[PDB]
Amino acid sequence: MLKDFGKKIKSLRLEKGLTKEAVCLDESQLSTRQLTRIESGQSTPTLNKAVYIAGRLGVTLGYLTDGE
Amino acid sequence: MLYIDEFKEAIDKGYILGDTVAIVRKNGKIFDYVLPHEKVRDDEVVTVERVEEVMVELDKLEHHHHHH
């Protein structure tokens, strides 16, 4: 995933009024610590974590990759 | 869920310095790392482990395991 992904998902999450806990749920795919690191750019998201986040935020993967 | 590339990134970028790091294991297996001032939940099992041994254990996941 490219570095703009973290910027997109942070702003989208905040816009929707969702917590990091609401995105990560049982955390088997992503812990709240891990999501925080992705949103700041500290950590690059794996593809599997990225598609998990997209589903939780209610958008397709292509939307967050801008069709790339 | 934590794989080798994510862990190596944290080392290479300087988020994990030195020879040991806090590790969360869930169901016995490496689940996440924990950095200073990140929050741990009461039912997470946390252990200070040697970075080089975490690397070896995570690299096991990268090897091909054939099955019939």
Numbering used by the authors:
A (entry chain B), B (entry chain A): 1 to 68
What are the paper's exact sentences on this?
Within S. pyogenes, Prx functions to inhibit the quorum-sensing receptor-signal pair ComRS, the master regulator of natural competence, or the ability to uptake endogenous DNA. ComR is a quorum-sensing receptor and a transcription factor that belongs to the Rgg subgroup of the RRNPP protein family, many of which regulate virulence in pathogenic Streptococcus species. ComR is a monomer that contains a DNA-binding domain (DBD) packed against a tetratricopeptide repeat (TPR) domain. Specifically, Prx binds directly to the apo-form of ComR preventing DNA binding in vitro and acts as a repressor of the S. pyogenes competence regulon in vivo.
